[PDB]
């Protein structure tokens, strides 16, 4: 718990710096859960974590491995049926509560944040088969999202193999015409080399910030499509008091954060 | 925290011309205390699905606060088989109202909670429920808290020839429920049947919870299997012991028959009704006055006996 | 307890004698309730009472005045949300479980079993406004029913003012013509004089029996339409044991069965 | 069943010149309701071990009902550090009294329950507790509900040279305790500390139990681990909600400070005291009058908050 | 919270500084209670509070006004019958566990620690009658004790009117001469001016220290007998952190520590 | 469950015919427990069974094997500490409640009911060693008893090998002089051949009644000392309705009652 | 914390010579896992009061680990009428043993927990229990850990002409009891009756608690009412699932009758006995080995059925 931070910790901290206080956060396990746990503990104490299996207002002790773990179930405010969860994300949109933020993952992504986590290749005869959609599709249809992605050139494609989670589709106006809620979409992309954002008026991806261990060119070199890296700023290393927290309080067993 | 006085809860969240939803089922865990406050506050033009109603909706109607009512059933089952003020006010042509079955009312709210674009059911066909609209399309085009169409007939996309009854889903404004325990952050616990209480709390834009007791956010989480609604869904917790009186509250108290009978005969006429509302609602400053007016031994004797779940006099057993 | 049974008692015991061991009985309060109780406790110990509030497999101690009464709630096998009761009855049909028998009631009844419980006279400006559908509409659409009525000529009409709960409509094929499940409908009608059934081929009501207190003629004098009272048999008076029972255990408080 | 009214319980089991025992510990689960009835009934010449007493024994003494008192401590700890009527009445030389330690009082009752021929202890030596008798042997020879000797010194049969203090064991006449739940057959449940309540119930010739609630013989037996005294030991169950007021009752209600303060200053003088006893005891017909006199919201606000075990105002949390 | 500490606060913090980690502390309410609380919460987190009612290993949230207070009861590790508390303290001695430290108090105190809490003047016709022994008699017979007293000349006498709780009697061998456990007795005396101890060889009390507010002389002017105030040292004023604490957490209601 | 009653059932029924209603009954397991269970169920419904391990007001379902079985523990009114039980039997004597009856067993017995269940032979070097006293001694010191005994001549001795449970000692006045409560003693002896009683004025044993399967001479022949059999009457066979009860409801598993 | 393995704990707090006390009642809640380690460790020359003793003291006796045994009753009640190793060794003249009535034994332990100088009882008189000493004054005098006098007749200081039996209060070095839950600080929860368990954990100088499960300190305090012993009285806490096997353990499992039957026959001879011990005790490295030897399903089929409190096969219900 010192100053030798890992790339995952850099990400998990950067995630946690985005959770405003009081907002509702949909997460799974993995890095977003770590980040949620860290904001929950320091940056935004009254934010509320909710998971797709219907577990409401979570506060885990030992970190959960799956979103239906007793690690969550026994440490939540309300244990609801899955259906009420979907009922919840939709109503938030209807209520215009505008306080929900969600995390999704994936294997490929494109300039407009459309994500694929179903399969690589032809969907009928795929090179590689993943689990499929899960609740990712509901989340990306009705929630403002933060996308967790590996920064490989082969993942940042001009066009993906399957859109399991709909982003800004094709630019301005795209979502509404496909009959998707228009004022909810991909907010930020967090990869292992930094954070990317989507233009407010063109919806196209641009580099927002890069980690100390990376640079705009590193970013450009590992992206299958062109980016506007000329606007990116370097983020700062994780506050050591936090890295201590992640290692000692949050994930001592190194289930998602392994030390050097 | 979200703990607030009744006067403040109501004044802030409940407004005139609002589509409201009141929890409870006839004479069981109805949010009476909140109804009285809405009344004193002069809140009017309320439109809402009655659900399996009783005294609570009767009193709003009789006091002329309801702009549009969506009925399915209204009574203090066991005492007054038909809410006298509701029937008189309708027969006299003062109450604008619609009729769906109780099945379709409860399914309506729940479909709202679940977020369905509309509710498709194969109920209500071949009956007056579809033959006749209590509120016409011409009238509905003026009511902003009511859909233009009572319903529509549409084909089952997967069973040609068969037609289903598509009912519009309610966009509830405020939900007011009465639970046995809640906590400063919103987390509510309803012991026993929730009826439509969780659906409305989830679906409503604003939800208010009056409760018999407030416990701490930490105590309520020690066993999350007793909870029913997460606090992100509640906007105001209001401490109101016996706030469901004279309707029962599971685990705590039984219904006050004597008080239900009084209301029964008193509501037979608007003259007596208004008199009743003056003494018990408008003349009383608050819920504590109401409680003291009733009496200590009164409330004590309503108490649920462990083992039965309802009150009886063990001193005769 | 003794030889002086009331009309209501006659109806209750008659209702109890219609229940079969193993069947699911939908009830409310009143005579049907007193009927189910007496069956459960005497005639068919293992039948399962269910009410429209969502309280499944009920066994009350003291009689409930309502369907949501704690007297039912604290004494049932499971408390389900209202909507699951609708779904249950629908599924019962879909499964072709054939075991459900539901009780209903109303203000008027026509020769085909159709019942009115909403209002008498012009629906939009009624002479007499009642509660409304309740869940009887649902029960009528999907369950074999036993209708309860007061034997009054103004009640038994040819054309009722409003059809709240659908019966056989107009005759064979009617329910189908209207879109209602075809293999389900009015099976019996119990009133203060006897039990009337529905013709297998014409679905038109006819007197199947009459209480020791009535006669085929009295029934006629009180039915506002033509009845075939040629097949009617006379039922026997209630057995003291069951009267003792009803009085001293099922309803000693005379909530419904107000004893002499 | 053994369920009976307070008036009847007292009149039948409690008599003048009786060695009584009252359960509770200072301001916790004291059987006040029963004390009031004993008073109205004019029961006098009561001799009994006070135990860790407070208002209950103070009031009997002040009303001059106690023929012989066996003290160890008397106060409404936190309010009145010394039961004013007890001290005045003793200093003025009206109260015949003895002093043992609290340790030896509790050990005395328990030894009674256990059936020991006498209690041998190595406590009270080298102190005023053995040096001086509050009731002399000459006085004791006239008191029939008191042993001739305050105690004796005897040798330890197994440790020569060492002498032990042999205290006489109490032969209690009537024990009156207040429990949270009892049942028609006597079975009692005391939630929390029993203090001396079970010892006295077991030892007493007659025991009376006032309770917050009566449940059925079948319900109370469903989990026998919550029970404390078998019914063969109880003679009368008396329903008396809040019958321990103003002393706390574990799991239910906290102490009424405001009422304790009133008694504090009121008892400073016999004039005011008698006035207080006229209004709250002699002018009141029964326990229901007492409850109604207090007020609905009054009692409600004494309520124990789950998680704390004592009352606080969650609407300020 | 600030620099203006009260006399009572001085006594409480001084009491807290006498508690040791791991020891069993017998208390009641008042300053000793405030003393144990501050120790438990600050100075000795793992000491175990026990009261004479039978509530073992206590940890109150809001301060109890009594020893049977639900404020103790609902917050302890075990609720034992009164008699088991007597037996515990006796056994503690018999085992020679040597860890128990009990607090007591009274109306008068003599040079050997003997204390009176029963009555002032002729016992049979007192000038001032108090509650009586309580369990202090028992505590005095078997536990090392810290006596609390008000520093008044009429309190500190040569011969007290009544010995409720035995101390060192007359000097070495006295307790033994009287039949009281010999290796146990008055250890300290805390009052509003300083702490007085008992001479190892003569068991006669002498001033061991005095508060910043007092002086060896003031102590003398207020002791009704000859004191050796030649070894006395001056204690330091209470630390704000502990005053803040006492005021804002241990007793914000000022039940005992009535703040300025 | 017919008319072929066993000798044990004859005994267990005869035992049960002695339990008056409302009285308190101390029993173990074995025949007395069966008998208690039968009276409890039919002859004396409100009698109360208590066992020496402190289990108060018992109502077993499956019969217990030992007096501390969960079979008793989970089906009693009050679970008290052993000591309170002894406290109870004594107080009953002090209260003069005169409603307690108790069962004891044993290997030998003499004219005055003194029983031995400790050892056969010299107590220091015994031919046969039993468990010892258990609670038998308390029971026979403070309770009116019923003694369960085998009717062998070698068990009915003029003088036993050890008195673990004191009867009438030596006749009139014997008990009090030994310092034993004088108005509590052996009430009845129940063996496999009938019931024996003790003279009211001489305390000596005499035959009271013999079973159908036995006779006074059978009794005399299997008794080591003389008896007054000339006063005995024949008991009647067990009511078949009861034998059905013992076999079906009470002990279906034949733990203490084996069928033919 | 006080959490330590059953090997470490037994080695540290138990020693030959010791006057021990074992919790539980016959085939109900006996500390078996522990009694196994005592044997397995060559611990010997122990003295103790049996209480309602079962196979536990039989195993110690038969394995010649008892110098003097204070007795009231010894039988694996139901299965073995009179323990075999026990009656054999005593019959052989190979065991030093005293007999007291069971009442006196449970009292003796109680008076010890209490702190009494000695125990006066009006029991055992006029019985051979006073007319015969098991351990003579002559042998008692040469024994460490055994009173020089079994009892002493003494006058009743308050009832002249009357004498009582005085009994020495025992000094217990180690107390071993089995409970359902315990915390790392020693707080112990025993569901159901406790027998002598709480007394001997208060009396004994050192106390070892084997428990089915261990819960956090924060947790076990959530409801103070369920705790039976304060951490202070407890030295070693050991996690030992089914540690009472083959005996019952309220709310968890029923006795293992087949097993107790094996032991019943096995213990009829020293050979069969020693053979048995070599397999079940001496040959196994630890308690886990014992559980595994037994096998999963075997343990599962001993579980208590909620509502019944014991085990019944419900698939045949
Ligand atoms: Cu060693």
UniProtKB/Swiss-Prot annotation, chains A, C, E, F:
EC identifiers of the protein: 2.8.3.12
Catalytic function, reaction form: trans-glutaconate + acetyl-CoA = (2E)-glutaconyl-CoA + acetate
Active site: 52
SMART domains reported in the protein's UniProt record: CoA_trans (SM00882)
InterPro entries in UniProt: CoA_trans_fam_I, NagB/RpiA_transferase-like
Highest taxon of the lineage: Bacteria
Functional pathway: Amino-acid degradation; L-glutamate degradation via hydroxyglutarate pathway; crotonoyl-CoA from L-glutamate: step 3/5
GO MF assignments: glutaconate CoA-transferase activity
GO BP: any one term: glutamate catabolic process via 2-hydroxyglutarate
Annotated keywords: Cytoplasm, Transferase
Compartments (UniProt record): Cytoplasm
Major localization class: cytoplasm
GO cellular component: cytoplasm
Function: Catalyzes the transfer of the CoA moiety from acetyl-CoA to (R)-2-hydroxyglutarate and related compounds like glutaconate.
Subunit structure: Heterooctamer of four A and four B subunits.
Entry's family note: Belongs to the 3-oxoacid CoA-transferase subunit B family.
Name of this chain's protein: Glutaconate CoA-transferase subunit B
Organism: Acidaminococcus fermentans (strain ATCC 25085 / DSM 20731 / CCUG 9996 / CIP 106432 / VR4)
Chain's gene name: gctB
Curated annotation (Swiss-Prot), chains B, D, G:
Gene3D superfamilies xrefs: 3.30.30.40, Glutaconate Coenzyme A-transferase
Domain of life: Bacteria
Any single biological process term in GO: glutamate catabolic process via 2-hydroxyglutarate
Any single Pfam family the record assigns to this protein: CoA_trans
Pathway: Amino-acid degradation; L-glutamate degradation via hydroxyglutarate pathway; crotonoyl-CoA from L-glutamate: step 3/5
GO MF, one example: glutaconate CoA-transferase activity
InterPro entries xrefs: CoA_trans_fam_I, NagB/RpiA_transferase-like
Entry keyword annotation includes Cytoplasm: yes
EC number: 2.8.3.12
UniProt GO cellular component terms: cytoplasm
First-tier enzyme category under EC: transferase
SMART domains in alphabetical order: CoA_trans
Subunit structure: Heterooctamer of four A and four B subunits.
Family the entry assigns: Belongs to the 3-oxoacid CoA-transferase subunit A family.
Name listed for the protein in its UniProt record: Glutaconate CoA-transferase subunit A
Species of origin: Acidaminococcus fermentans (strain ATCC 25085 / DSM 20731 / CCUG 9996 / CIP 106432 / VR4)
């Amino acid at each position: 718990d010192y100053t030798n931070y890992t790339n995952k910790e850099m990400q998990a901290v950067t995630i946690a710096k985005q959770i405003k206080n009081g907002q509702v956060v949909t997460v799974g396990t993995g890095l977003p859960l770590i980040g949620a746990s860290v904001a929950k503990r320091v940056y935004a104490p009254d934010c509320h974590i909710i998971v797709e299996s219907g577990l409401m207002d979570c506060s885990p002790v030992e970190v959960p491995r799956s979103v239906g773990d007793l690690r969550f179930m026994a440490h939540c405010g309300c244990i609801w049926p899955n259906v009420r969860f979907v009922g919840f994300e939709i109503n938030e949109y209807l209520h215009k509560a505008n306080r929900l933020i969600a995390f999704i993952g994936g294997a490929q992504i494109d300039p407009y944040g459309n994500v694929n986590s179903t399969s690589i290749g032809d969907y009928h005869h795929p090179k590689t088969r993943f689990t499929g959609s899960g609740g990712a599709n509901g989340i990306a249809t009705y929630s403002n999202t933060i996308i967790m992605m590996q920064h490989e050139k082969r993942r940042f494609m001009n066009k993906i193999d399957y859109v399991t989670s709909p982003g800004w589709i094709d630019g301005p106006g795209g979502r509404e015409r496909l009959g998707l809620p228009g004022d909810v979409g991909p907010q930020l992309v967090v990869t292992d080399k930094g954070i990317l954002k989507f233009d407010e008026k063109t919806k196209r991806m641009y580099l927002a910030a890069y980690y100390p261990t990376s640079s705009p060119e590193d970013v450009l070199e590992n992206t299958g499509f062109d980016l506007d890296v000329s606007k990116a700023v370097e983020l700062e290393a994780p506050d050591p008091a936090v890295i201590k927290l992640i290692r000692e309080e949050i994930d001592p067993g190194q289930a998602f954060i392994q030390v050097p | 925290s979200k703990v607030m006085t009744l006067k403040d809860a109501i004044a802030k969240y409940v407004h005139s011309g609002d589509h409201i939803a009141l929890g409870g089922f006839t004479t069981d865990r109805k949010p009476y205390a909140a109804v009285f406050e809405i009344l004193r506050q002069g809140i009017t033009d309320l439109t809402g699905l009655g659900g399996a109603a009783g005294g609570d909706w009767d009193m709003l109607i009789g006091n002329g606060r309801v702009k549009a009512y969506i009925n399915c059933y209204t009574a203090n089952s066991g005492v007054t088989n038909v809410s006298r003020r509701f029937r008189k006010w309708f027969e006299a042509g003062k109450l604008t109202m619609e009729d769906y079955s109780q099945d379709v009312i409860y399914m309506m709210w729940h479909a709202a909670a679940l977020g369905l674009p509309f509710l498709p059911v194969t109920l209500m066909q071949g009956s007056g429920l579809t033959d006749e609209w209590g509120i016409s399309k011409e009238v509905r085009k003026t009511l902003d808290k009511v859909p233009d169409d009572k319903f529509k007939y549409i084909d089952n996309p997967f069973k040609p020839g068969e037609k289903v009854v598509a009912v519009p889903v309610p966009q509830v404004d405020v939900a007011i429920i009465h639970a046995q325990q809640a906590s400063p952050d919103g987390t509510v616990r309803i012991w026993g049947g929730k009826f439509q209480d969780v659906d409305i709390a989830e679906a409503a834009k604003y939800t208010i919870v009056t409760c018999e007791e407030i416990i701490s956010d930490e105590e309520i989480r020690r066993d999350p299997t007793k909870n029913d609604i997460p606090g992100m869904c509640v906007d105001a917790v209001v401490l109101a012991p016996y706030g469901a009186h004279p309707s029962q509250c599971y685990g705590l108290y039984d219904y006050d028959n004597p008080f239900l009978k009084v209301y029964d005969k008193v509501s037979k006429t608007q003259e007596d009704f208004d008199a009743f509302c003056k003494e018990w609602v408008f003349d009383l400053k608050d819920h504590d006055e109401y409680l003291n007016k009733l009496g200590a031994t009164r409330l004590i004797n309503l108490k649920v006996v462990p083992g039965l779940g309802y009150h009886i006099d063990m001193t005769k057993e």
